[PDB]
Amino acid sequence: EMSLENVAFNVVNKGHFDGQQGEVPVSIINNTVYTKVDGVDVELFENKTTLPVNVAFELWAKRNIKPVPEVKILNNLGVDIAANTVIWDYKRDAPAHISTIGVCSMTDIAKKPTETICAPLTVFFDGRVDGQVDLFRNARNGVLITEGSVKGLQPSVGPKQASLNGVTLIGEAVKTQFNYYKKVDGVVQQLPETYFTQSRNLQEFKPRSQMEIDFLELAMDEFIERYKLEGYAFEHIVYGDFSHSQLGGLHLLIGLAKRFKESPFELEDFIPMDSTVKNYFITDAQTGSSKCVCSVIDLLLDDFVEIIKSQDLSVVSKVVKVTIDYTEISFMLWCKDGHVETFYPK
Amino acid sequence: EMSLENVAFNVVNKGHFDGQQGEVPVSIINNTVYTKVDGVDVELFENKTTLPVNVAFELWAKRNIKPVPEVKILNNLGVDIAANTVIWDYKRDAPAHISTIGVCSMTDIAKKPTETICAPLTVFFDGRVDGQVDLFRNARNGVLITEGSVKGLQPSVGPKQASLNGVTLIGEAVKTQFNYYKKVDGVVQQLPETYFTQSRNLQEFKPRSQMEIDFLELAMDEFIERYKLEGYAFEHIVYGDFSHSQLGGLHLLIGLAKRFKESPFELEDFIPMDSTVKNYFITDAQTGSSKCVCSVIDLLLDDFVEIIKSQDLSVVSKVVKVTIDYTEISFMLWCKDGHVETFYPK
Amino acid sequence: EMSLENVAFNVVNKGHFDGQQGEVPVSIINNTVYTKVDGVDVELFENKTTLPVNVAFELWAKRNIKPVPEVKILNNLGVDIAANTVIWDYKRDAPAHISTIGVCSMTDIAKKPTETICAPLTVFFDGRVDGQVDLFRNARNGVLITEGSVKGLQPSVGPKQASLNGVTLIGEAVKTQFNYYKKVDGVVQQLPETYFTQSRNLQEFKPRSQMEIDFLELAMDEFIERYKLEGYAFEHIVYGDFSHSQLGGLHLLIGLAKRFKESPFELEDFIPMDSTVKNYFITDAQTGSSKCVCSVIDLLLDDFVEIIKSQDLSVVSKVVKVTIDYTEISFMLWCKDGHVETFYPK
Amino acid sequence: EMSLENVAFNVVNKGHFDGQQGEVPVSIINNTVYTKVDGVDVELFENKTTLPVNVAFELWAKRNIKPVPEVKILNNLGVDIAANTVIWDYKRDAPAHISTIGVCSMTDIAKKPTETICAPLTVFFDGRVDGQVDLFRNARNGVLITEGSVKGLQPSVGPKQASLNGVTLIGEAVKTQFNYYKKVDGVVQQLPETYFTQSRNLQEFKPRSQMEIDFLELAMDEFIERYKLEGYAFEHIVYGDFSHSQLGGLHLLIGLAKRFKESPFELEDFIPMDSTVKNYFITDAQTGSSKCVCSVIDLLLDDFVEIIKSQDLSVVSKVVKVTIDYTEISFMLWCKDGHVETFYPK
């Protein structure tokens, strides 16, 4: 039975849709789902999507509550749709994908990923659900994730972290490290060697390397000297310049974290979704230095210095392609006389 | 199974809720219920009530599609709630009653009318549904309707017409004449002898007596002379005066019908519900004569002349109580020297 | 006391705001004002305006229920605001003017028209309300209407018809013919001699002259011959051509009425407001002849033939200015060899 | 005068409805009440309830701003309605009860609690308002709270804390400790001896006993040894297990507080209302350990250990009834060989 009342029953008694039988009273008002508990209406769900409220409620109740790849990783892999599950985008507070396969009658384009309509679409397959590995094998286009090895397919190790109920974490009691496989037009693709962003947060930033600890603790000159980073414009690219009315650099999240612990500032996420590179409207509350569009990428500082030391500085201006999160990120690089002047993502 | 999808399935395949099993895709947008037919959304229901859209949709799907007493009759009998059915008010486009008994989880105050909560409420019982006569017998307060005789209870013959799917009609293939019984505080009440309104419409007005035919066909003086109605101000009470900027009389629907066939006018029903007496904002398009509040009652012309000839005209001003539609309607009467000056309902 | 509950009380007991004391329960849902009558919510008002629902409800309750100039006349006179009344636009189902003077706290720009803010605005004054003639005398900009003569001011006779509760009518029991006065920058203007549109309707079109009766009754050639209208393209300008996929002519409402009685067609009023000239998307249901933009003006046929016979036909193409409804309407005229080819308003 | 404008005036000039005279401009948009201050609209109220926006605004303005019993206590006492006041549920952001008595015309079922309709309902009476003690005496069903002794009635001492403007606090300048009395069917009931929850918060958790201080400061083994809690599964029931993908225990708020100070986690309150026992969707951000439904009760640690030491551990599995917050809470208890295996509320 697929019903709004049954979905609300599952949400009330299980926190999510568990497939139980039963129904509860449901009232739908402007864009909100309420249920009656002890004679009063209690809000169950508030629709922040562009879908109808009941459709969005059902998709949210049937979201995957296991660790899943972050939405940015799936986007960079060209995933169009998930097989028999809902990936919830907690940054957008909406389903990650427009259509579903065997989830909701109002959004399903098919009941199984084997149907003809799904063949041109890149379908996401979870190897932790039984049978989906074979579905990926028979799939024309798809991306498979597994927690272990798959016979006949060369794995690609993904990021250490994954999303669990909207919380990005590196699993200890649960496994968040996935092997990734991709098939295009029926043939397996070799996923390129890639860096991965750390998916950290400005407020609760925590270093993940000795170099990051030194960056957060040592002064600018002290840290630059210790890791012999002279000539790579670290004072501008990473630390950030606040002397002018226009903010300079601050293109890595670790620099923003250091400044934020030094002094608060305002970040305006004018495109609130998940991406490898984020653009912010930053206003430095201390000096008044601002930048309408600042590009920030949360690479590990070791990975960033390794990337920036692998580029010859004999070109005055160029665009460098770095494979991060399974996608090619374009960094604009300006150099002067063998030393970096600017290096920022787009 | 009580579900929005099942209710929509019944509406799609049966026109109303028939209790069938099955479900259809449902989308709920601003205040409208849509279903997907051949890949496109088709509007099933538009909520014009103050209830939540899904609740109103379910109550509308479970409305009584048999001939039922008009809403005004039930209101005048003090009915608060119906037993195991929904009376739909088609003039208000809403349920006739706030709560239900065994219909909708969001509106039910009880599952059966025998519960303690229903005892102080006047419950409507339909004798055409099996077992409800005994429920009325055991009921503390209630109004029962039957199509035949009930042993041990003296019947009260109601109006000839009843409402079927919002259409007021005197039944030929179906029975619309009901016997009415009432119990207050556990004791049967004797319903008073009463007149009944005809529930006719201005545009499709059709006479129901020879006197009404004469009124619609004969001129004012000719008709007044034929039925010796001199001295009862029929030229003002019924025919209506349009010589002044303020409209005069026109307090019976038959007079409005005669004028409307003579010349169109505007009626504004500023309280759009069902009542024995209706108040209108009338604008005569021909002369510009208007009245902000005009009281109209649709009595049979024979009944109205019988009522007006039963009142002595020796009182300059008084209020007369006439039992119409099982309720006491107050007519303001002004007389001068033994002849009527004004006689209008309130 | 200015209150939503008091306004609803006045609407319930008087049909409009009469200034009575009292209050009724009010519920405001999505864009609708309901009141509770006998325990059920009855819709009082539905907001079709861009104003807040309560503001629009109060403005609608305080609308002028006397005969007032049609909205198009007030627009052509440059009226910006009314003094101490609300002109309701029944075609738009909205107030005729954005602001008020002494009506609603949420829309008032002033409490009296004598305040400084009202001086640059053209204020509408009604001579039927006591004291407003003197307010017009002291007004810097304004338009005054009276039912009689005003000492020291030369009157301008307006149209015979006026709007009463949204119904356009020529008054018999009430006076709808107004004298118009205008003051700009503190000096009285002489309103030009003007024609007036008839404000008639397609469905209930009724001729108002012997020439119009002949047009509706006589055939095209018979009528053209009778009134010696040869050479003025009446077969195209007025009667309308349906032989091609693009509709021809039909620029006067009387021609549309004749065709409509001959055969129905679709009129799409894509700018649903009141104007001297209306543009329609017309689809002839009989032949399929259509025109995306057809300009229609409802002049009296005698006035139209008088206008068209007063223009020399020696110019191949020109624009003619005709003062209609106190505004200059531009007619595009094309002639060939002394006879009219096309003559349509804009 | 009961008016939306007067209610808004009181909110603007007093923060709540104080009964003052006056009115301010009010605009109602989608579900929000705005007022005009210095020519711009300022939001006064946003409707998060299922009531109409104006009704909810009036009920919110007339909420009780004195210390009142928490909503969970009133629910456990079977309170259906308050006498002449509004209890606001700040967790639901809505009135605690559907109907009122002498508050709002749109929600009142009666004007005084002495009316017949209120007799079957359990009415809440406040002894701090003059005359309500006698109303409780004459009441058939009701719950009375007082700050002092009541002659002829044996008091029941309630919790130390009460809610003041949505803030749970133990009063110092104000009295938050109430004596509770209950009458059912006209006869006074003896409220059972009960424990009370502490109504504390995870983020601002503060210990209220030496045992709680030891729990928050001492390690798990150290604290268990100090209070000889061996054999009662405190390492699982209270501290919480994070070694598996499914979270274990953590059924008391003090354990959640200790973990939260140790490391942050996500709590999803999928039924956001006030209850003695709360169910959460908990995701441990450190280990990834999660539980869809975790039952949490905020008892004082001394009370919890007293309860758990009063149960014989000779039953492998049973349900224990503990009277907390004037209601019987069911704890599922599993024991093995005289020592607790699991003990969690429902």
Next chain:
Amino acid sequence: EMSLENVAFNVVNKGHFDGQQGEVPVSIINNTVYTKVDGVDVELFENKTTLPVNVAFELWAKRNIKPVPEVKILNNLGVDIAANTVIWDYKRDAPAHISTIGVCSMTDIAKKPTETICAPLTVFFDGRVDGQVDLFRNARNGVLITEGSVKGLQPSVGPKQASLNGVTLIGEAVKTQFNYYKKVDGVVQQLPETYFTQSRNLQEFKPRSQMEIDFLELAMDEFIERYKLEGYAFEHIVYGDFSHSQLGGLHLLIGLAKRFKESPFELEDFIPMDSTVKNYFITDAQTGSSKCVCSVIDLLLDDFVEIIKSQDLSVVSKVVKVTIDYTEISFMLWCKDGHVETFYPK
């Protein structure tokens, strides 16, 4: 090109409206503007204003992103409208002014401030935009701000802080100190000598003087003794009294900050806009002491003590006018025998 799609393009690619060419897909749902990024809808804007969603979106995109005077300063100067810019009120999340000049077609009253309609309005002119100084010179009513000196006009130095993207700050990399000029009826006014509020926040309160540091660090008696503040009721006016159920004093934000660092409390801003004096519904969480209306002004403590020491205490009760933020604030002062009893703003 002025278009919703172009405005959304500028917001997506620049964070604000920069005047670039291009368009992006836009979807408008209930009160929200979404755009499609990588096939999914991403919320760009949520309308919290009383304007139409697209109008509010365009006004928000064209807001001034340079340091601007705080909204309270502009209100106190009588500013009605800005010349060719949008001042965004971040506290109200709405435009600071109802109309615009050359910004949005739906809100413009003029395209340039030189038009006749703008003459009676006080127009805000920014001297950092080229040509606006001359516009102020030719303006009849206006307020001009400059970063430097203006020939022929005596400057008035404003507050040190200004608003940048909603963040109040004293600029270091950018200039936030403005000279203010005012013209009324075409003649330059001499702005009075004034104090300025500090626009600080309760949570992130930071002292700005040695006296404020002493107040936050020293005890009440110690601080009062150090600055010889005996006899001015500092223990009540500034520190706040929590011994009674009604909160006492606490009329300066520094006292609230000291208490908040001592113990949290609830502030309810029932009129959430920007003013020199703010009214709060304060509930002290520690003692339960509350006050429905508490007036708070964020003056520098040095300025407040200078003001309070400049008033003779020989009057039992009076109203004192202090020019703060270019407006006269009325302080109610009660004294007893030459010492202050109460001194609070209104």
